[PDB]
Design a protein around this ligand. Structure first.
Ligand SMILES: *[C@@H]1O[C@H](CO)[C@@H](O)[C@H](O)[C@H]1NC(C)=O
Ligand SMILES: *[C@@H]1O[C@H](CO)[C@@H](O)[C@H](O)[C@H]1NC(C)=O
Lengths: 48, 214, 43, 49, 48
């Protein structure tokens, strides 16, 4: 049960939550801040 | 542990990309049946395009034009065609109207740039050649029409457009920015960048048996 | 003419190494135990 | 056809086996558990409609 | 806001109707000429 809950928490980093990519470093390489923040707010909301 | 230095690892290729052969073509295609060059195995300066006074717009989606020189793509697809100056509004993802459906439907999730400019100097004469009417479909009784361009035409003037669509796949990259490679560093915490895949970590050489395509 | 696919015709779905792991992909695959049409070069 | 497959990558990173998750109910069970071995039990693999 | 002369009056973080309700520590007024095409660029997060 502990291992399943950790594996589930780690695996949830791969999810988009509606961002254009689930990788934070993609958004920061691709997008300038005024448009990047809209994508990162979706990732923060899902990861939180 | 904060990273000690940055490491940049782009492919060992230096030939400049053929954008000039798109942007200065003798004729841009009739929009009902647009044309599409593929760029691959070259170095892509985007600042030479974005800095140019020649462009009435340079609008990008899924990427910011300021960032394009950091990216490293597997292919780049450049569409080329002519439209009236009002219709540049319809060349964007999620639009509605005659250009947005009947000849050049963009994907709803497009990552790319639309680069458009007035060409009333060179496409007007009138000239009646440029013929008009799913995502990246060519829409070859049936509807056929063509634009009437005279230099006296602003919304009815000819605009030339290039649309760059970017391939962010995980394959070996081939269309990469001017950002020059560093040496590799091992057993040290570094701000690494392989083909635009940025991260931070201790790089160390591995015993893992990657198959030749991986 | 027909024969069975059995479990033939799986392929590496992406350019990625993975090891000692089970990965559930969804992609265009040949379905297991489906029929495959069978033809000849000659005779 | 568009299908979910569960792929067994071995120690050397070659795919050595797979489960077609839409073939039969045991294959849905293997894919529900992300596992090629299934222990004795009752497994809620799907919802039908 | 009531003048016919202003071709645009675009406000951010406040509505032009509401401004008579507010007090500010300061107003700065930044004054310049541009070509009409670049009036798009005079906004938070715009580019060119
Ligand atoms: C188009 O032609 C001009 C003049 O020959 C040249 O300076 C320019 O570099 C060409 N365009 C591009 C995008 O290279
Ligand atoms: C894994 O690789 C090693 C070295 O090539 C080899 O001896 C071994 O037989 C391989 N095992 C499998 C199951 O492929």
């Amino acid at each position: 049960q502990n291992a399943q809950a950790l594996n589930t928490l780690v695996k949830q980093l791969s999810s988009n939550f509606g961002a254009i990519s689930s990788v934070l470093n993609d958004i920061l390489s691709r997008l300038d801040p005024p448009e990047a923040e809209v994508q990162i707010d979706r990732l923060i909301t899902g990861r939180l | 542990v904060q990273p000690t230095e940055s490491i940049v690892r782009f492919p060992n290729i230096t030939n400049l990309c053929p954008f000039g052969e798109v942007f200065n073509a003798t004729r841009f295609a009739s929009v009902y049946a647009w044309n599409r060059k593929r760029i691959s195995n070259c170095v892509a300066d985007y600042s030479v395009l974005y800095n140019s006074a020649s462009f009435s717009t340079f609008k990008c989606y899924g990427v910011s034009p300021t960032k394009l020189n950091d990216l490293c793509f597997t292919n780049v697809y450049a569409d080329s065609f002519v439209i009236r100056g009002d219709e540049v509004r319809q060349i964007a993802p999620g639009q509605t109207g005659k250009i947005a459906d009947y000849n050049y439907k963009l994907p709803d999730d497009f990552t790319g740039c639309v680069i458009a400019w007035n060409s009333n100097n060179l496409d007007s004469k009138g000239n009646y050649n440029y013929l008009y009417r799913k995502p990246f479909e060519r829409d070859i009784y049936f509807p056929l029409q063509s634009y009437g361009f005279q230099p006296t035409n602003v919304g009815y003037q000819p605009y030339r457009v290039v649309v760059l669509s970017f391939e962010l796949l995980h394959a070996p990259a081939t269309v990469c920015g001017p950002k020059k490679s560093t040496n590799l560093v091992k057993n040290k915490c570094v701000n690494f960048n392989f083909n635009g895949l940025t991260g931070t970590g201790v790089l160390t050489e591995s015993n893992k048996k990657f198959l030749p395509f991986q | 003419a027909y024969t069975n696919s059995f479990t033939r015709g799986v392929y590496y779905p992406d350019k990625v190494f993975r090891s000692s792991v089970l990965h559930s992909t969804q992609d265009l695959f040949l379905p297991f135990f489906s029929n495959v049409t069978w033809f000849h070069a000659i005779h | 056809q568009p299908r979910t497959f569960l792929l067994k990558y071995n120690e050397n990173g070659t795919i050595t086996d797979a489960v077609d998750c839409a073939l039969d109910p045991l294959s849905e069970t293997k894919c529900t558990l992300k596992s090629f071995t299934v222990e004795k039990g009752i497994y809620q693999t799907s919802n039908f409609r």
